[PDB]
Amino acid sequence: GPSGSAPVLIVGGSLVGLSTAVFLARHGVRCTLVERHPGTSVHPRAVGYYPRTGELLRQAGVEDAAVREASGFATHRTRAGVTSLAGEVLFSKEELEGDDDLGDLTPSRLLLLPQDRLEPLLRDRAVELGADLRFGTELVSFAEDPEGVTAVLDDGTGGTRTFRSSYLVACDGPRSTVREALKVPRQGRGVLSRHVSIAFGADLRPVLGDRRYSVVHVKNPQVTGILVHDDTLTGGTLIVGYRPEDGESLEDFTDDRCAELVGAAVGAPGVEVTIRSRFPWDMAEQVAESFVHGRVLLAGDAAHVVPPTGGYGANTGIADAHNLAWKLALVAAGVAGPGLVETYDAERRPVAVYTAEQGSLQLALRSGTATPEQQAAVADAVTVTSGQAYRSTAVVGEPDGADLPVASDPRELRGAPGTRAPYVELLRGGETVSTLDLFGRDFVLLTGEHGREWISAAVSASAGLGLKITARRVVPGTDAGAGTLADPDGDWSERYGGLRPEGAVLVRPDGVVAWRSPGADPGGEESAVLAAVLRSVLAR
Ligand SMILES: Cc1cc2nc3c(=O)[nH]c(=O)nc-3n(C[C@H](O)[C@H](O)[C@H](O)COP(=O)(O)OP(=O)(O)OC[C@H]3O[C@@H](n4cnc5c(N)ncnc54)[C@H](O)[C@@H]3O)c2cc1C
Ligand SMILES: O=C(O)[C@@H]1C[C@@H](O)CN1
Ligand SMILES: OCCCC[C@H](O)CO
Ligand SMILES: OCCCC[C@H](O)CO
Ligand SMILES: OCCCC[C@H](O)CO
Ligand SMILES: [Cl-]
């Protein structure tokens, strides 16, 4: 029998599915999420979230909560190699070199928060916004027809139930039920190496003393691996490899064998070790050839598995959720055509390919197997995560505008179409407001001081297309009043690419520039031009 319907069914309740639920619910889209596990993750995989992801958590309403939960990890500022935690230090450096001078580009910083503490924050936020989260519930099969998707659900309580949606968003991980049902092929290097993550309890306070590490590379004759200690210094995760080609297998990782390895990594006799969880995983590079299959969308690790060297995977998946959610909201609202959904593939798949390659390059670099060309190809994590340029029907390039790389120095992009609309602190009323805090719900049009023709065009297009558009003139200095944003520094038009006083920029709900005009329309047809821009972007 039926167990309901909703515009969107989300499969998977890890970071990408929970993020999808939050962003859809924030746009007022009713969704149901199914997660086979009885609750959120027991074994944390992700720990590091780059500043763009911090900006996306702020849009989600959970960044401040995450930063408060992470306050113990805030001191873990050093990456190190050691023989053991008790033993000799082999190298020591900063975890993210210039985390300290990001302030010109973003108000966020590197966030270190284990995944098992971030997921509950997203879960509680999704529930507050009205998402229907069904844990202990597995998607078994589905079928698409011209009007929707019918899913078969198993909550273990005997019999299966059907669910009917308009869209199915597969956030169901590297072995995606949905991707495999659809027989979507994946490209890339495939499986490179086999690993186990060993979550452990051990009192490390006497061994670490006052030292606090982000990540520790351990190398001694008994164990080679990565240790990440927790904020209370009473446990962590030891990540090791094994080689089936040498007769090693997962079966080898008994509790006793895991405790031996953790003890060897800690290096202090008499340290009592508790094994909390053993998480097997493969180091892999595999990207789906397409992320949109009619009414079925692939997001996160269902769409792309990247080598975890560089910590890009959850960052990339949360940005996928953020890209798709506003698009499904506008299609479900009847304000956009279904072509807008296809742009999820056009925009996120090339990022996924680039990011998967970056993970692979980091792995080559750390493995000492990197050619001089592969070394030169490694990008800054802020370039990978903040420097993206989209090409799709939801981006309208300037006539003179040139084709941008998939990712490049974010400091140079200066609000080009398809890139992140820059962070500028402006004034509204008596408050400071970030450009970033204007974005996340509606289209936003920001104009120069003399941009009233573009403002008028936004008011007209809003009525004509049934679309809310926030439109403001940005006025340099502090001599500004109601209906404007003040730009005390006079930085805004330069940071947005040298917009003239009559110029304008149109920002999508995801904070990506859709379109800009340096000045007035040459033909004085601002109203017709902005309407045509929005019709193209909205696939109508
Ligand atoms: C050791 C390690 C370290 C990492 N460190 C970082 C890091 O620091 N930063 C970072 O950004 N990323 C990191 N990553 C990557 C990150 O963990 C993943 O990219 C991320 O978890 C993917 O999220 P997801 O929601 O797409 O998939 P998953 O986390 O794989 O979750 C998928 C969910 O779907 C559920 N599911 C599957 N099939 C079904 C079904 N049929 N019905 C219902 N539910 C289903 C599963 O139970 C699971 O809970 C790391 C990964 C590893 C392995
Ligand atoms: O669920 C289990 O079987 C164990 C219990 C805890 O140690 C975490 N994992
Ligand atoms: O570096 C420690 C990894 C050992 C793997 C294990 O020995 C498989 O049998
Ligand atoms: O408890 C240590 C923090 C979590 C680390 C994570 O498990 C690494 O994948
Ligand atoms: O003099 C300070 C100006 C405040 C700006 C105004 O509130 C624009 O919205
Ligand atoms: Cl990763």
XYZ file of C-alpha atoms and ligand atoms in Angstrom:
630
model
C 0.000 0.000 0.000
C 0.938 3.739 -0.317
C 2.913 5.556 2.473
C 2.517 9.006 0.916
C 3.684 11.381 -1.731
C 5.777 14.518 -1.938
C 7.265 16.648 -4.642
C 10.729 15.211 -3.783
C 11.846 11.890 -2.382
C 15.470 11.979 -1.077
C 17.329 8.653 -0.797
C 20.039 8.763 1.872
C 20.329 10.699 5.136
C 24.087 11.407 5.371
C 25.451 14.905 4.778
C 24.236 15.230 1.163
C 20.681 13.927 1.655
C 20.206 15.957 4.909
C 21.584 19.058 3.148
C 19.128 18.407 0.239
C 16.242 18.193 2.755
C 17.278 21.441 4.465
C 17.646 23.389 1.184
C 14.345 22.075 -0.303
C 12.417 22.718 2.974
C 13.952 26.251 3.164
C 12.474 26.902 -0.372
C 9.074 25.634 0.914
C 9.257 22.316 -1.057
C 7.683 19.382 0.802
C 10.122 16.463 0.789
C 10.454 13.031 2.307
C 13.870 11.517 3.038
C 14.524 7.792 3.516
C 17.712 6.539 5.265
C 18.187 2.800 5.816
C 20.261 3.352 9.032
C 18.235 3.855 12.231
C 19.795 7.280 12.774
C 22.617 9.541 11.616
C 26.211 8.279 11.073
C 27.892 6.229 13.867
C 31.329 6.399 12.144
C 32.408 9.896 11.090
C 34.233 10.108 7.740
C 34.280 13.819 6.895
C 35.948 16.308 9.256
C 37.011 19.313 7.150
C 34.637 21.833 5.494
C 36.129 24.603 3.386
C 34.840 28.165 3.582
C 32.335 27.815 0.699
C 30.697 24.983 2.605
C 30.630 27.293 5.677
C 28.717 29.841 3.542
C 26.261 27.063 2.458
C 25.799 25.984 6.161
C 25.010 29.657 6.960
C 22.321 29.688 4.210
C 21.084 26.412 5.858
C 20.896 28.223 9.291
C 23.397 25.828 10.995
C 26.897 27.400 10.525
C 26.934 29.136 13.971
C 25.716 25.864 15.658
C 28.433 23.896 13.777
C 31.164 26.386 14.773
C 30.017 26.198 18.452
C 30.039 22.339 18.332
C 33.571 22.542 16.671
C 35.053 24.956 19.265
C 37.325 22.162 20.720
C 38.661 21.412 17.182
C 39.443 25.139 16.625
C 42.908 24.620 18.291
C 43.824 21.698 15.944
C 45.869 23.954 13.642
C 48.946 21.757 12.909
C 49.387 18.862 10.416
C 52.235 16.512 11.463
C 54.099 13.297 10.661
C 55.366 11.249 13.624
C 56.792 7.782 14.275
C 54.070 7.546 16.962
C 52.178 10.133 19.060
C 54.628 9.304 21.944
C 57.633 9.299 19.575
C 59.579 11.630 17.324
C 57.959 14.371 15.206
C 59.068 14.063 11.540
C 57.380 17.179 10.130
C 54.943 19.887 11.333
C 53.047 22.534 9.244
C 49.728 24.582 9.265
C 46.585 22.590 8.221
C 45.447 25.370 5.754
C 48.309 27.880 5.161
C 46.429 31.230 4.767
C 43.158 30.308 6.607
C 44.051 33.600 8.514
C 43.826 36.047 5.443
C 40.740 34.572 3.673
C 38.869 37.542 5.177
C 38.903 39.564 1.911
C 37.211 36.619 0.037
C 34.887 34.990 2.597
C 33.711 35.394 6.201
C 34.042 31.613 6.717
C 37.200 29.634 7.619
C 38.145 25.956 7.595
C 35.649 24.168 9.877
C 36.859 20.951 11.565
C 33.777 19.040 12.812
C 33.412 15.292 12.629
C 30.556 14.249 10.302
C 28.638 12.465 13.160
C 28.229 15.872 14.958
C 27.335 17.843 11.796
C 24.626 15.415 10.555
C 22.409 15.865 13.721
C 22.519 19.643 13.223
C 21.274 19.257 9.624
C 18.705 16.637 10.682
C 17.218 18.951 13.410
C 17.190 21.902 10.964
C 15.434 19.822 8.219
C 12.787 18.685 10.792
C 12.228 22.312 11.967
C 11.716 23.454 8.295
C 9.130 20.675 7.779
C 11.007 17.884 5.916
C 9.617 14.365 6.555
C 12.694 12.298 7.608
C 12.199 8.515 7.676
C 15.197 6.710 9.233
C 15.336 2.902 9.313
C 13.659 3.027 5.895
C 15.310 1.585 2.760
C 14.522 2.336 -0.920
C 14.297 -1.159 -2.527
C 13.259 -0.276 -6.114
C 11.641 2.514 -8.095
C 10.048 3.172 -11.509
C 9.784 6.487 -13.389
C 6.711 7.231 -15.571
C 5.925 10.498 -17.426
C 4.298 12.102 -14.311
C 6.483 10.909 -11.393
C 8.540 8.248 -9.616
C 7.010 5.384 -7.646
C 9.440 4.073 -4.994
C 9.169 0.842 -3.014
C 10.172 1.428 0.679
C 11.108 -1.166 3.363
C 11.123 0.002 7.046
C 11.947 -3.617 8.139
C 8.453 -3.837 9.834
C 7.549 -6.715 7.429
C 5.796 -5.479 4.263
C 7.006 -2.883 1.705
C 5.054 0.403 1.016
C 5.040 2.629 -2.110
C 5.841 6.319 -2.162
C 5.138 8.655 -5.069
C 7.157 11.761 -5.909
C 7.748 14.204 -8.783
C 11.574 13.937 -8.394
C 13.912 11.389 -6.806
C 17.208 12.806 -5.503
C 19.693 9.942 -4.977
C 22.019 10.848 -2.067
C 22.645 7.158 -1.403
C 26.471 7.078 -1.475
C 29.218 5.332 -3.485
C 27.214 2.066 -3.994
C 24.016 4.069 -4.860
C 20.966 1.795 -5.193
C 19.543 4.372 -7.620
C 22.635 4.896 -9.836
C 23.046 1.108 -10.133
C 19.313 0.582 -10.972
C 19.672 3.218 -13.737
C 22.908 1.513 -15.022
C 24.631 4.916 -15.206
C 28.291 4.336 -16.092
C 31.102 6.030 -14.146
C 34.404 7.253 -15.583
C 37.801 7.717 -13.905
C 40.774 5.742 -12.527
C 38.384 3.441 -10.493
C 39.545 1.768 -7.171
C 43.178 2.728 -6.339
C 43.604 1.179 -2.801
C 41.677 -0.519 0.035
C 41.386 0.994 3.550
C 39.826 0.704 6.982
C 39.002 3.574 9.319
C 39.379 2.474 12.977
C 37.433 4.728 15.372
C 38.928 4.257 18.871
C 38.791 5.357 22.501
C 42.135 5.949 24.208
C 43.375 8.502 26.743
C 45.794 10.605 24.633
C 46.011 13.522 27.134
C 49.336 12.266 28.674
C 50.836 11.507 25.186
C 49.797 14.763 23.370
C 50.240 17.110 26.332
C 49.498 20.637 25.066
C 49.880 19.600 21.382
C 46.828 19.745 19.110
C 46.986 18.337 15.582
C 44.439 18.486 12.710
C 45.839 15.348 11.072
C 48.803 13.108 12.039
C 50.712 10.946 9.524
C 52.031 7.957 11.476
C 54.952 5.882 10.186
C 56.696 3.177 12.194
C 57.518 -0.498 11.579
C 54.196 -1.694 13.152
C 51.775 0.779 11.437
C 51.524 3.368 8.670
C 48.406 5.527 8.569
C 46.551 8.734 9.341
C 45.458 9.522 12.904
C 42.836 12.200 13.634
C 42.418 12.811 17.385
C 39.141 14.168 18.813
C 38.624 17.431 20.736
C 38.576 15.741 24.236
C 41.871 13.875 23.446
C 40.122 10.621 24.507
C 39.809 8.988 21.101
C 40.117 9.430 17.367
C 40.312 7.566 14.076
C 43.312 5.627 12.745
C 43.051 5.107 8.950
C 45.199 2.303 7.458
C 45.563 0.492 4.110
C 45.743 -3.195 3.264
C 46.837 -5.027 0.127
C 44.735 -8.065 -0.993
C 47.529 -8.762 -3.587
C 49.711 -9.646 -0.491
C 47.008 -11.891 1.090
C 45.656 -9.086 3.379
C 41.871 -8.756 3.813
C 39.244 -6.968 5.884
C 38.947 -10.233 7.847
C 42.444 -9.367 9.333
C 40.981 -6.311 11.150
C 39.737 -8.118 14.284
C 39.173 -5.928 17.415
C 42.525 -7.248 18.805
C 44.401 -6.469 15.535
C 42.784 -2.956 15.418
C 43.827 -2.267 19.083
C 47.409 -3.405 18.268
C 47.505 -0.927 15.364
C 46.030 1.970 17.439
C 48.452 1.159 20.300
C 51.400 1.137 17.820
C 50.238 4.518 16.426
C 49.936 6.040 19.958
C 53.348 4.521 20.888
C 52.906 4.683 24.725
C 52.936 1.392 26.697
C 49.929 0.937 29.040
C 47.460 2.940 26.875
C 44.130 1.056 27.056
C 42.455 1.023 23.621
C 38.707 0.611 22.950
C 37.679 -0.058 19.322
C 34.418 1.892 18.659
C 33.803 1.208 14.904
C 35.592 -0.252 11.852
C 34.623 1.458 8.561
C 35.980 -0.199 5.391
C 36.325 1.991 2.296
C 38.101 2.093 -1.054
C 40.182 5.000 -2.291
C 38.497 5.576 -5.687
C 38.033 8.038 -8.541
C 34.649 7.462 -10.225
C 32.261 10.105 -11.664
C 28.822 9.293 -13.171
C 28.604 10.193 -16.918
C 25.342 12.129 -16.241
C 23.728 13.363 -13.007
C 20.181 13.911 -14.399
C 18.027 10.962 -15.580
C 14.578 12.429 -16.219
C 13.022 12.876 -12.756
C 15.992 11.152 -11.025
C 19.002 13.255 -9.894
C 22.324 11.909 -8.522
C 24.067 13.973 -5.813
C 27.103 13.520 -3.540
C 29.016 10.237 -3.616
C 26.192 8.584 -5.691
C 27.337 11.014 -8.435
C 31.115 11.171 -7.668
C 33.607 9.292 -5.487
C 36.871 11.218 -5.056
C 40.022 10.079 -3.222
C 39.631 11.605 0.289
C 43.114 13.223 0.045
C 42.192 16.921 0.048
C 38.837 16.420 1.895
C 36.706 17.478 -1.106
C 33.896 14.856 -1.133
C 31.322 16.194 1.423
C 32.220 19.788 0.406
C 31.367 18.871 -3.238
C 28.180 16.921 -2.313
C 26.769 19.754 -0.103
C 27.374 22.155 -3.023
C 25.473 19.679 -5.361
C 22.463 19.668 -2.902
C 22.572 23.501 -2.809
C 22.678 23.736 -6.642
C 19.709 21.413 -7.301
C 17.336 22.442 -4.432
C 16.371 25.954 -5.696
C 15.958 24.568 -9.277
C 13.521 21.839 -8.200
C 11.701 24.486 -6.058
C 11.186 26.824 -9.066
C 10.114 23.900 -11.391
C 7.670 22.597 -8.683
C 6.359 26.221 -8.298
C 5.652 26.392 -12.129
C 8.000 29.433 -12.458
C 10.747 27.462 -14.305
C 10.600 24.887 -17.111
C 12.062 21.379 -16.600
C 15.156 22.383 -18.665
C 16.346 24.162 -15.493
C 16.777 20.694 -13.886
C 19.214 19.649 -16.673
C 21.545 22.548 -15.705
C 22.257 20.618 -12.452
C 24.241 18.149 -14.640
C 25.778 20.890 -16.865
C 27.105 22.765 -13.783
C 27.932 20.107 -11.185
C 29.293 17.257 -13.357
C 32.317 19.218 -14.710
C 33.085 20.326 -11.089
C 32.881 16.680 -10.010
C 35.369 15.618 -12.756
C 37.798 18.441 -11.833
C 37.457 17.712 -8.109
C 37.926 13.907 -8.551
C 41.145 14.684 -10.520
C 42.300 17.068 -7.725
C 41.805 14.265 -5.146
C 43.857 11.967 -7.427
C 46.618 14.631 -7.857
C 46.838 15.149 -4.034
C 47.129 11.341 -3.698
C 49.970 11.227 -6.338
C 51.654 14.221 -4.547
C 51.559 12.556 -1.040
C 52.530 9.148 -2.610
C 55.662 10.785 -4.195
C 54.480 9.440 -7.663
C 53.602 12.979 -8.982
C 55.232 14.181 -12.262
C 56.330 17.851 -12.327
C 53.186 18.523 -14.445
C 50.910 16.736 -11.874
C 52.546 18.788 -9.028
C 51.880 22.022 -10.980
C 48.172 20.935 -11.583
C 47.374 20.719 -7.799
C 45.007 23.602 -6.859
C 44.453 25.430 -3.531
C 41.354 23.903 -1.768
C 39.747 27.429 -1.776
C 40.166 27.554 -5.616
C 38.603 24.062 -5.939
C 35.618 24.932 -3.682
C 35.122 28.723 -4.214
C 36.594 29.301 -7.716
C 34.057 27.377 -9.833
C 32.682 28.745 -13.142
C 29.404 27.279 -14.515
C 28.405 27.119 -18.215
C 24.730 26.187 -18.712
C 21.388 27.634 -19.839
C 21.112 29.066 -16.238
C 24.140 31.350 -16.993
C 23.898 34.168 -19.579
C 27.430 35.284 -20.546
C 28.267 38.822 -21.662
C 28.408 39.305 -25.477
C 32.162 40.200 -25.138
C 32.536 37.643 -22.228
C 34.986 34.678 -22.685
C 34.605 31.008 -21.504
C 35.925 30.535 -17.923
C 37.814 27.508 -16.585
C 35.918 24.966 -14.405
C 37.885 26.347 -11.396
C 40.436 29.153 -11.069
C 41.715 31.789 -8.642
C 38.525 33.147 -7.002
C 40.247 36.523 -6.379
C 40.242 37.117 -10.186
C 36.621 36.057 -11.013
C 35.096 39.400 -9.798
C 31.415 38.405 -10.221
C 31.710 37.010 -13.790
C 28.565 35.145 -14.894
C 28.618 31.550 -13.655
C 30.869 32.372 -10.598
C 30.193 32.980 -6.910
C 28.838 36.550 -6.427
C 31.560 38.193 -4.303
C 31.438 38.809 -0.556
C 31.102 42.541 0.244
C 29.934 44.032 3.564
C 27.237 46.647 2.801
C 24.861 48.734 4.975
C 21.064 48.343 5.149
C 19.117 50.311 7.776
C 21.462 50.607 10.764
C 22.953 47.118 10.163
C 25.931 45.678 8.267
C 24.737 43.058 5.758
C 26.955 40.663 3.736
C 26.109 40.350 -0.008
C 26.184 36.594 0.860
C 23.315 37.106 3.391
C 21.167 38.646 0.569
C 21.456 35.357 -1.393
C 19.894 31.935 -0.849
C 16.111 32.367 -1.450
C 15.183 34.699 -4.315
C 16.940 36.081 -7.347
C 18.746 39.295 -6.363
C 19.543 42.147 -8.703
C 22.259 44.545 -7.467
C 22.811 47.711 -9.524
C 25.176 50.658 -9.510
C 23.985 53.951 -7.982
C 22.353 55.073 -11.313
C 20.794 51.646 -12.059
C 17.039 52.661 -11.862
C 16.381 51.298 -15.431
C 17.593 47.848 -14.243
C 15.613 48.212 -10.950
C 12.464 49.053 -13.044
C 13.217 46.023 -15.265
C 13.326 43.793 -12.156
C 9.980 45.125 -10.814
C 8.368 44.520 -14.306
C 9.919 41.086 -14.803
C 8.866 40.063 -11.259
C 5.189 40.756 -12.181
C 5.516 39.324 -15.734
C 7.215 36.043 -14.764
C 5.627 35.467 -11.322
C 9.130 35.559 -9.701
C 10.194 37.442 -6.539
C 13.320 39.518 -7.323
C 15.072 41.539 -4.610
C 16.442 44.590 -6.413
C 18.759 47.188 -4.820
C 20.965 50.040 -5.903
C 24.412 49.926 -4.302
C 25.476 53.485 -3.394
C 29.200 54.134 -2.646
C 29.934 55.917 0.675
C 27.364 56.314 3.526
C 25.020 59.044 2.012
C 22.281 56.435 1.227
C 18.652 55.792 2.401
C 15.697 53.343 2.076
C 15.654 50.945 -0.948
C 19.481 51.127 -1.323
C 22.507 49.338 0.058
C 25.405 51.589 1.143
C 28.972 50.637 0.163
C 31.109 52.623 2.677
C 34.466 51.420 1.229
C 33.388 51.894 -2.462
C 34.668 48.293 -3.006
C 31.424 46.815 -4.427
C 31.509 47.788 -8.134
C 35.279 46.859 -8.355
C 34.774 43.447 -6.589
C 31.846 42.787 -9.045
C 34.094 43.383 -12.107
C 34.010 47.216 -12.440
C 30.240 47.744 -12.801
C 29.518 51.340 -13.864
C 26.813 53.355 -12.041
C 24.157 52.170 -14.624
C 25.374 48.532 -14.511
C 23.729 45.534 -12.810
C 24.359 41.930 -11.720
C 21.679 39.238 -11.383
C 22.384 36.629 -8.679
C 20.663 33.229 -8.591
C 19.246 31.761 -5.382
C 22.513 29.744 -4.976
C 24.630 32.933 -4.907
C 26.007 32.319 -8.455
C 25.966 35.236 -10.873
C 23.457 34.556 -13.717
C 24.139 37.662 -15.753
C 25.728 41.078 -15.577
C 25.692 44.326 -17.517
C 28.714 46.652 -17.009
C 26.439 49.668 -17.767
C 23.066 50.698 -19.243
C 21.524 48.603 -22.022
C 22.974 50.076 -25.291
C 19.407 50.045 -26.801
C 17.752 51.414 -23.604
C 15.695 48.161 -23.414
C 16.621 47.123 -19.802
C 13.082 45.754 -19.201
C 13.032 43.501 -22.341
C 16.691 42.431 -21.752
C 16.281 41.411 -18.091
C 12.993 39.608 -18.918
C 14.751 37.678 -21.756
C 17.661 36.839 -19.365
C 15.271 35.463 -16.745
C 13.216 33.525 -19.332
C 16.434 31.821 -20.588
C 17.763 31.130 -17.058
C 14.327 29.752 -15.928
C 14.083 27.550 -19.151
C 10.751 29.129 -20.207
C 38.253 8.581 5.558
C 37.432 9.659 4.883
C 37.663 10.979 5.165
C 36.915 12.004 4.559
N 37.163 13.307 4.922
C 36.444 14.240 4.325
C 36.599 15.557 4.710
O 37.348 15.925 5.647
N 35.820 16.492 4.058
C 34.925 16.181 3.074
O 34.342 17.132 2.483
N 34.733 14.945 2.720
C 35.445 14.003 3.316
N 35.222 12.702 2.975
C 34.168 12.364 1.998
C 32.783 12.337 2.605
O 32.669 11.439 3.776
C 31.755 11.887 1.556
O 31.983 12.619 0.351
C 30.325 12.104 2.034
O 30.027 11.345 3.227
C 29.330 11.723 0.956
O 28.029 12.059 1.491
P 26.739 11.377 0.831
O 25.599 11.811 1.672
O 26.761 11.623 -0.629
O 26.992 9.791 0.924
P 27.246 8.798 2.176
O 27.958 9.564 3.250
O 27.909 7.597 1.598
O 25.819 8.398 2.738
C 24.877 7.715 1.892
C 23.734 7.313 2.766
O 22.727 6.679 1.949
C 22.189 5.607 2.699
N 21.571 4.689 1.751
C 22.238 3.992 0.764
N 21.407 3.262 0.044
C 20.159 3.488 0.593
C 18.882 3.015 0.242
N 18.674 2.148 -0.750
N 17.833 3.432 0.992
C 18.059 4.317 1.977
N 19.212 4.822 2.390
C 20.237 4.394 1.626
C 23.373 5.044 3.472
O 22.953 4.244 4.570
C 24.112 6.325 3.882
O 23.753 6.765 5.181
C 35.941 11.665 3.593
C 35.739 10.324 3.287
C 36.473 9.315 3.903
C 36.185 7.886 3.548
O 26.648 -0.801 16.226
C 27.546 -1.526 16.611
O 27.399 -2.748 16.386
C 28.756 -0.896 17.326
C 28.368 -0.375 18.718
C 29.261 0.839 18.932
O 30.542 0.439 19.387
C 29.376 1.454 17.557
N 29.230 0.315 16.638
O 50.064 -0.315 8.526
C 49.254 -1.169 9.140
C 48.447 -1.848 8.055
C 48.430 -3.337 8.278
C 47.366 -4.068 7.492
C 47.054 -5.464 8.093
O 48.326 -5.980 8.374
C 46.277 -6.469 7.124
O 46.548 -7.781 7.561
O 37.342 11.254 16.286
C 38.340 11.838 15.394
C 37.616 12.743 14.582
C 36.920 12.032 13.380
C 37.893 11.659 12.249
C 37.248 10.893 11.035
O 36.813 9.615 11.455
C 38.313 10.703 9.875
O 37.703 10.052 8.716
O 25.262 56.698 6.831
C 25.134 55.316 6.994
C 24.187 54.917 5.942
C 23.333 53.685 6.236
C 22.842 53.068 4.951
C 21.351 52.961 4.642
O 20.708 52.374 5.736
C 21.149 52.217 3.227
O 20.237 51.157 3.330
Cl 37.001 13.544 0.371
